[PDB]
Design a protein around this ligand. Structure first.
Ligand SMILES: [Mg+2]
Ligand SMILES: [Zn+2]
Lengths: 141, 147, 54, 56, 83, 56, 54, 171, 56, 56, 56
């Protein structure tokens, strides 16, 4: 429902926003009357400094491993709990398939581009109806 | 001269005393995420390219690079690189009008200036075409320089 | 107290025991971002309308 | 530790050094009420000198 | 709760902080087109005009000195002995 | 510590300091680039309307 | 540079620290957040009802 | 209802208004803002009684901007609606959901569902009028409306009325 | 204090979710999008909660 | 007044030591306007040496 | 900056080059030496804080 902010100059109002963005001053200004359109400009490079949608999608997950000061009993109970919830999603085949495909590509000394193209192809096929089997070896080859 | 201060002869400075050269290397590389999106070194046009920096693009060639010997200053784009975008991915501001690509060039530093010394293009390990640039600048000894 | 060292423990005990802050301390007025009672701001300036006719 | 130890201590409009909570540390700042920017080393002529010089 | 004039037991001398905020607020008002009560000798800077008004006690202000018990006093800058 | 008690602020300049006996005690020599970079918002008054007009 | 508001402007005095009651949490919140996904399935906008919805 | 209440308001003045006559200015402002406006706590402010004995108290200077703040206590005649209050009014605008009754400075709305079954809407007339089995509700007609609910938003008050119950309808 | 703290309130039953103004995500190059750690933690709380409800 | 006398006792002893009849009539040989000027300067500087309320 | 003297106001004198020039009678409270030492310069943005900064 709308939610689209469009910057316009109320003094000029003669054309769609043909503006200039001053990053050093942190403003955006109309290149005609010289009137600023917005102050306090946000950055995208600065938030990126601390840090894959193409393959993993929007799914999120976090690992549980052992801690600095912890017991080995709690590490097993948390991993066994995830082992019971691993059936909630059918994405175990993508990680194992990409693992074995990773082993074969690393065994064939092929570049990473062919690895990403092959993983993308297997992601395009995945589990469709026209495949109807092939025992996971033929779709990988 | 007080407090470890030094007075230097100006005529000696003009004749080339303690003058040094500074070589800054800007390395850029085009990459491909999932083969569908491919970064390309090219000269961005001001008509169809969105998110273009306010720097001048007259010093770039047809391949998106500056030939050595061209005097460059701050806020000048040395290597022009554009990234493909999707129309239904962002549609921010005028993205539904530029249609084509998004600028992602690597300009020179804001406070720097000099003469481009050497530019070379080569494919790396996985075959990605990267380019290295080297600009030289003579730094005449100033009052604020330390010895 | 939380500003100096152990922030989370002091805050948790504060919320647990329903603690109240007077908010005339130095760091408190700093955090909230308004005038503190130190020096120039330790007194208010007024106006006397009976003095304007002088 | 010294800065964060002595911070919320000031002198109000009654010549009494007390913190923000009202706890009185010193009833008079410096036990005399004098700033540290107008004090000079002085000599006491009452104790100095002998008894014959005092009576003289 | 407003101590009367016969019970004001604070220092009658204007402190450096009171003079500072009086010159700052008065100069800020003069910068915002305030009625000047003293004839100017050709000044242009607002702080110099504020100090010119303080030198003749023509500043129309009164200080509300807060006491530690919550009370306050009203010492007008005209009756305060400067310096 | 990095967002309340202290913080990175604007309207500032950092550089190497050096001596100059020809200057006064309280003054400081500011470079022209720093003087043109930093600014100060002054209020337009009938006393400096012509001067600020010249600056414009 | 922000937009003007007609609400009365006052300073911040007393600050009270307390625990969050679950009923008050449900009375302050606006969404339930049920989908662990970040953005929408179309890889754009937001999930609408997820970790970061409008 | 037309009540009389002592109200207090904080008036802000620019440093250019610090002349000896400033008190008058205060009263001036105290009129221009209070009379005619509305508040969600005391209702529509009509008039302001006692113009000569207006207390000025003491003006205080807030930090920045240097503007002056005043606390004025006065007596004023205000109008505040109430839920379930029988009032009278005259129609102004007509709608298919109901006619909009005008009660003083408040424009009450009457929902069509809150009307009797014999009262029907007629758009073929100019202006469109509500014709019943005996009474015809037109713009210039006077109708006694029983207010069921009222909304007290800041500087804006709207109420909802009805005429379904007995001893109501057109006057 | 009844109006502020309760032992029943000390035990967590419902969990507030802070807005992205607290955990700002990033969408760099439209294909490299990074989410904050608290977002991943909320995803873990959702997966564990829905998993526990399904098992119960 | 007790705190005032107990806070001014030492300074009053110093003034009574430096301001003796023999020390003024013999050594200083001060006159009327000179002595009164010394008194006004001592009282004045004593009124300027007072610490200001509100200092951290 | 461990002294209250380490932060002091100054009168700006516009000079060329790029180094902050100052008199050597102020390097002792700053504990500085002209050997690559950088300093910071903050600018007030209001007349009230400029006058309060000049009188204190
Ligand atoms: Mg050093
Ligand atoms: Zn414009």
């Amino acid at each position: 429902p709308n939610l689209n902010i469009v910057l316009t100059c109320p003094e000029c109002k003669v054309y769609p926003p043909k503006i200039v963005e001053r990053f050093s001053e942190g403003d955006v200004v109309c290149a005609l009357c010289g009137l600023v359109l917005s102050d306090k400009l946000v950055d995208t490079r600065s938030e990126w400094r601390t840090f894959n949608p193409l393959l993993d999608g929007n799914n999120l997950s976090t690992r549980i491993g052992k801690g600095e000061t912890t017991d080995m009993r709690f590490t097993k109970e948390l991993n066994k709990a995830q082992g019971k919830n691993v059936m909630d999603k059918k994405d175990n085949e993508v990680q194992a398939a990409f693992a074995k495909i990773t082993m074969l590509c690393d065994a064939a000394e092929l570049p990473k581009i062919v690895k990403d193209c092959a993983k993308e192809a297997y992601k395009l096929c995945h589990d469709e109806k026209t495949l109807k089997g092939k025992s996971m070896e033929s779709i990988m080859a | 001269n007080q407090e470890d201060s030094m007075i230097m002869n100006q005529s000696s400075i003009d004749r080339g005393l303690f003058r040094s050269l500074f070589f800054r290397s800007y390395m850029d590389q085009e990459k491909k995420y999932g083969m569908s999106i491919t970064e390309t070194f090219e000269k961005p046009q001001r008509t169809n390219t969105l998110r273009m920096k306010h720097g001048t693009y007259d010093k770039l060639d047809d391949d998106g690079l500056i030939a050595p010997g061209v005097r460059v200053s701050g806020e000048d784009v040395i290597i022009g690189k554009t990234t493909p975008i999707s129309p239904d991915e962002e549609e921010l501001g005028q993205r539904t009008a530029y249609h084509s690509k998004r600028d992602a060039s690597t300009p020179l530093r804001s406070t720097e200036n000099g003469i481009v010394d050497q530019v070379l293009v080569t494919t790396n390990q996985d075959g990605l075409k990267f380019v290295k640039v080297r600009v030289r600048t003579t730094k005449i000894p100033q009052i604020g320089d330390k010895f | 107290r939380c500003s100096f060292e152990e922030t989370v423990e002091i805050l948790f005990e504060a919320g647990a025991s329903a603690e109240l802050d007077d908010c005339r301390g130095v760091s408190e007025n700093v955090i909230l971002g308004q005038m503190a009672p130190i020096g120039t701001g330790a007194f208010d300036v007024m106006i006397d309308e009976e003095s304007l006719v002088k | 530790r010294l800065v964060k130890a002595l911070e919320d201590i000031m002198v109000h409009y009654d010549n009494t050094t007390r913190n923000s909570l009202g706890n009185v540390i010193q009833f008079i700042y410096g036990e005399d009420g004098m700033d540290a920017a107008h004090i000079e080393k002085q000599s006491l002529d009452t104790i100095g000198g002998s008894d014959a010089a005092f009576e003289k | 709760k407003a101590i009367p004039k016969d019970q004001r037991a604070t220092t009658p001398y204007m402190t450096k902080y009171e003079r500072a905020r009086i010159l700052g607020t008065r100069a800020l008002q003069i910068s915002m087109n305030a009625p000047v009560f003293v004839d100017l000798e050709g000044e242009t800077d607002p702080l110099r005009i504020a100090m010119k008004e303080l030198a003749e006690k023509k500043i129309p202000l009164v200080i509300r000195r807060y006491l530690p018990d919550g009370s306050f006093e009203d010492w007008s800058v005209e009756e305060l002995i400067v310096d | 510590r990095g967002n309340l008690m202290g913080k990175r602020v604007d309207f500032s300049a950092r550089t190497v300091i050096s001596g100059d006996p020809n200057l006064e005690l309280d003054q400081v020599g500011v470079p022209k680039s720093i003087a043109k970079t930093l600014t100060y918002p002054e209020v337009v008054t009938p006393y400096n309307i012509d001067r600020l007009t010249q600056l414009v | 540079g922000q937009q003007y508001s007609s609400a009365p402007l006052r300073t911040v005095k007393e600050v009270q620290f307390g625990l969050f009651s679950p009923e008050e949490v449900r009375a302050i919140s606006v969404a339930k957040i049920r989908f662990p996904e970040t953005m929408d399935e179309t890889q754009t906008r937001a999930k609408i009802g997820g970790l970061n919805d409008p | 209802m037309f009540f009389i209440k002592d109200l207090s308001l904080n008036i802000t003045l620019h440093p250019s208004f610090f002349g000896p006559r400033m008190k008058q200015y205060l009263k001036t402002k105290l009129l221009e803002e209070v009379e005619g406006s509305c508040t969600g706590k005391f209702g529509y402010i009509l008039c302001v009684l006692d113009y000569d004995n207006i207390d000025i108290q003491r003006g205080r200077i807030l930090p920045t901007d240097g503007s002056a703040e005043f606390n004025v206590k006065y007596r004023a005649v205000v109008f505040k609606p109430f839920k379930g209050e029988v009032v009278d009014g005259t129609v102004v605008s007509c709608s298919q959901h109901g006619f909009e009754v005008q009660v003083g400075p408040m424009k009450v709305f009457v929902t069509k569902h809150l009307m009797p079954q014999d009262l029907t809407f007629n758009a073929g007339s100019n202006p469109p009028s509500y014709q019943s089995s005996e009474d015809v509700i037109t713009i210039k007609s006077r109708i006694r409306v029983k207010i069921e609910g009222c909304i007290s938003q800041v500087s804006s008050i709207h109420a909802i009325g009805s005429i379904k119950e007995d001893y109501l309808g057109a006057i | 204090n009844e109006v502020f703290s309760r032992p029943e309130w000390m035990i967590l039953t419902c969990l507030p979710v802070p807005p992205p103004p607290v955990r700002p995500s990033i969408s760099f190059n439209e294909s490299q999008r990074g989410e904050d750690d608290l977002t991943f933690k909320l995803a873990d709380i959702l997966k564990a909660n829905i998993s526990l409800e399904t098992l119960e | 007044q007790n705190a005032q006398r107990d806070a001014v006792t030492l300074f009053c002893c110093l003034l009574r030591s430096r301001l003796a009849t023999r020390r003024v009539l013999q050594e200083y040989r001060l006159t009327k306007q000179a002595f009164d000027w010394v008194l006004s300067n001592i009282e004045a500087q004593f009124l300027r040496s007072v610490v200001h309320p509100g200092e951290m | 900056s461990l002294h209250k003297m380490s932060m002091m106001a100054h009168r700006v004198k516009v000079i060329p080059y790029s180094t902050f020039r100052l008199n050597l009678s102020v390097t002792s409270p700053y504990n500085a030496d002209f050997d690559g030492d950088e300093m910071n310069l903050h600018v007030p943005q209001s007349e009230e804080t400029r006058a309060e900064l000049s009188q204190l």
